[PDB]
Design a protein around this nucleic acid. Sequence first.
RNA 1: GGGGAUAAGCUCCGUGCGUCGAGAGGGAAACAGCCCAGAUCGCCGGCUAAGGCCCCUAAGCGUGUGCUAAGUGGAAAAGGAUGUGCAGUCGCGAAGACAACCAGGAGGUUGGCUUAGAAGCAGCCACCCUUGAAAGAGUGCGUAAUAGCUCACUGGUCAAGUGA
RNA 2: AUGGUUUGGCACCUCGAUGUCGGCUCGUCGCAUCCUGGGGCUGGAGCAGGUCCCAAGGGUUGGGCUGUUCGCCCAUUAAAGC
Lengths: 176, 126, 37, 136, 192
Amino acid sequence: SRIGKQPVPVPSGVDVTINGQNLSVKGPKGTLTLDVAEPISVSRAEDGAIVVTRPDDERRSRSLHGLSRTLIANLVTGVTEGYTQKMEIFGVGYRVQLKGQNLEFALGYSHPVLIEAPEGITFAVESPTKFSVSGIDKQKVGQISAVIRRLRRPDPYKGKGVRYEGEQIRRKVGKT
Amino acid sequence: MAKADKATAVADIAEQFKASTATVVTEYRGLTVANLAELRRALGDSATYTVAKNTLVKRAASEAGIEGLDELFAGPTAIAFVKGEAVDAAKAIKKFAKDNKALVIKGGYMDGKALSVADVEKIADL
Amino acid sequence: MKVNPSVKPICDKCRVIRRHGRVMVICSDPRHKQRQG
Amino acid sequence: MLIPRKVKHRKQHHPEQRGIASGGTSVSFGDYGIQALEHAYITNRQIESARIAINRHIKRGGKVWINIFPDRPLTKKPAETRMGSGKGSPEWWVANVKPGRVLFELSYPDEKTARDALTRAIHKLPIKARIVTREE
Amino acid sequence: TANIPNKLTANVRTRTGKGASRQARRDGKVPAVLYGHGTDPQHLELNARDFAAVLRSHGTNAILTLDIEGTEQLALTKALDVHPIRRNIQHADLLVVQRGEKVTVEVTVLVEGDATPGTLVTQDANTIEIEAEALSIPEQLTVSVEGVEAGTQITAGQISLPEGVNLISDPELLVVNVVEAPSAEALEEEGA
RNA sequence: GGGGAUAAGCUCCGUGCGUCGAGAGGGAAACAGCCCAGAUCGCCGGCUAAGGCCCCUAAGCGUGUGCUAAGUGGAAAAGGAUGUGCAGUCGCGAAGACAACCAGGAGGUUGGCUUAGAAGCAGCCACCCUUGAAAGAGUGCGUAAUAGCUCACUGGUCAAGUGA
RNA sequence: AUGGUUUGGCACCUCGAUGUCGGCUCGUCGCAUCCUGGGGCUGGAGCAGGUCCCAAGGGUUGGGCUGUUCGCCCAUUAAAGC
Ligand SMILES: [Mg+2]
Ligand SMILES: [Mg+2]
Ligand SMILES: [Mg+2]
Ligand SMILES: [Mg+2]
Ligand SMILES: [Mg+2]
Ligand SMILES: [Mg+2]
Ligand SMILES: [Mg+2]
Ligand SMILES: [Mg+2]
Ligand SMILES: [Mg+2]
Ligand SMILES: [Mg+2]
Ligand SMILES: [Mg+2]
Ligand SMILES: [Mg+2]
Ligand SMILES: [Mg+2]
Ligand SMILES: [Mg+2]
Ligand SMILES: [Mg+2]
Ligand SMILES: [Mg+2]
Ligand SMILES: [Mg+2]
Ligand SMILES: [Mg+2]
Ligand SMILES: [Mg+2]
Ligand SMILES: [Mg+2]
Ligand SMILES: [Mg+2]
Ligand SMILES: [Mg+2]
Ligand SMILES: [Mg+2]
Ligand SMILES: [Mg+2]
Ligand SMILES: [Mg+2]
Ligand SMILES: [Mg+2]
Ligand SMILES: [Mg+2]
Ligand SMILES: [Mg+2]
Ligand SMILES: [Mg+2]
Ligand SMILES: [Mg+2]
Ligand SMILES: [Mg+2]
Ligand SMILES: [Zn+2]
């Protein structure tokens, strides 16, 4: 709650238009629209700041103030500069490339694996086993990250399979 | 630490300041317990070194015209006292910081007025 | 996924959280993961 | 394995449990002790198990007490005998307990370890119980 | 040694008997009776919350001043009725006392110190009886133990007591006994 | 109350107990034995008990004050849990608290026994001391043992509640 | 604590009649799952396991022995469920 109590600042190269309970954010990186829970309100600070308003001090408002504030901060950050999520594959015979909007993978499966990119998200492969994902909405970025992470099962022994950047895997070795 | 502990510490720093003539505040960050140990031994000839709380020292500084360092303690603060002469500790800390690259001097007090880093370096050379 | 009616943080690191009424506890140590029920 | 070593007669009637436990309602002897809540039986086996749980963990320090003692006998007619034909034979002895009674009593330095041991005793006991200290 | 009065308001109970008593107890007020040489015993209600709080803060014994429709009386607690389960107070007794009189008080004692590996800690008695003044009622007792071995029976009358108090309890009583610690053989021998 | 296992719709007693038996009526759907209450007959009258008042079904989808999110209500325990309401407390806290985001977090010191082996981390003892600012004979996951990752306390920015 | 399935207790229904064990035919349901299906963890390198969770759609031997139910044995299957 008091997390959302702070005022979210609007960068100069940003446009925001709000009607009713719905709000929209425009910027050089695209436009995102979302509808927030009806009970909680919000006002556009004249000083280039965002102030979310909770009509009450009880469950819904206390919970949703900071929620809406953080969601708006995230979407503004995405529409201003975006997000990136690199993914590296460690293991043998793991071929990963980018052909057009789609993705072709070599994860050791006897059948080729293809992943289709949702709209509004951009990819680029930089290394044979290393690549990143550039997107505007943190929601879609994370969704795709998890989706293509789950194309391989967990690997504790060799750590083989797609993993994130800051992710580390526990070590285990069996005697016999 | 208790409120009585805070009062005792502020009183101790006040007596040390009143018994001191010049002092300097630096940043202890990035220095190993070892290097702090040998710097303390080397300065144990005339200087006395310790660590103090920003807000407590800020309040204790109101007693004298040493408010020049209030805008300067912002951030980790290390307190240095010159019991013997004045340039001893200044030169010592300057050379330790230049050798470590992990010590940054934020300022110093002398003649009752806060001076810049270059001025403090010149005084230490003095 | 140790299932049982008594769930308690094993180490000082486990977390106990709720989900659709089924209170479960989670931790980085995968072995700890236990739900209630 | 507490058991009276001799009584006037080897069997007793069913009980009345109604009434608030008056005897030993306040801790006295040590510095900590359990207090039950609800009327119930407590078997000699239960008492001995709780004693073991307390003692083996406490180990060296401190010494315990047992304010109760199972005295009244009980019986249960073996299976495969149509009810009747007189009283059965005694199987186990039990000690009664009423709300507010104190079960065990401890004098060990540390409140934390005393609490922990008595908590295991509670878990091994058949009826609810809770910690209580000497104070008024 | 001097204490501080623990002021607390009180009112004369209106109805006497189980009916009014239980009704007040449900409300949150404990029935109370005070009596003494004043040849005028009478009966009042208290506040359970403040009552228990003061009990805790001042230990088993405390000297108090009572508010009766503006009248202030000095009394010392004598007896109590603690709920067997609830941990609440049913009945307390306040005995009128004036400054400069002798009363009999039972005082608890606490134990602290360091114990040797072959030292076993045991506490036969947690309280002792002592005579003192109305304003000189203590709330705790302490004894120091360091480097005791084998049989170290500590005598109750051997303890050092502050001034103004006489040991009512006879010297034959024992306060702290330290005996040889048991081993596995003794542990298995006992209980069978 | 005895017996049974405080099980039976069990059995055996006591009740200037009650009811059915030998009792219709209303309520608990149904249900002698539980609740309300004694049917002389008739009336297309009125007042009420128990139980009820959204519809099946007659009666407030009533009044005001609070609780619950579980269809709990409309089957159940030992125990478990940052569900949620109330009250009394207490500790710390603008001398800046708790959580985060920076740095240190060691030298005797590998503390002694034990071990091939004990070095902070199989195991037993003080669990001592020193620079201090904090190092705990170290809470763990770490290595054969070392050495690293942490961590406890301590210091910096943010700026009021936070813990039991 | 649960279920009402085994050994049991009660004698409330049936002595002017409620036919009893196995086998055969036929089945039907529950799920505390035997395989097949999906998961969590492993003292899960892999294969192969162990264990717990969801799941009742379907399937779930034949013979020798004894009246046998059962059980042992032989030899199959994914299994030879309660
Ligand atoms: Mg009885
Ligand atoms: Mg009797
Ligand atoms: Mg129990
Ligand atoms: Mg009866
Ligand atoms: Mg009969
Ligand atoms: Mg009649
Ligand atoms: Mg009738
Ligand atoms: Mg009817
Ligand atoms: Mg009549
Ligand atoms: Mg009808
Ligand atoms: Mg109607
Ligand atoms: Mg109404
Ligand atoms: Mg209404
Ligand atoms: Mg209301
Ligand atoms: Mg229900
Ligand atoms: Mg329940
Ligand atoms: Mg509990
Ligand atoms: Mg540290
Ligand atoms: Mg050792
Ligand atoms: Mg040492
Ligand atoms: Mg019959
Ligand atoms: Mg019949
Ligand atoms: Mg017939
Ligand atoms: Mg016939
Ligand atoms: Mg037949
Ligand atoms: Mg038949
Ligand atoms: Mg199932
Ligand atoms: Mg499977
Ligand atoms: Mg398994
Ligand atoms: Mg199934
Ligand atoms: Mg089917
Ligand atoms: Zn854990």
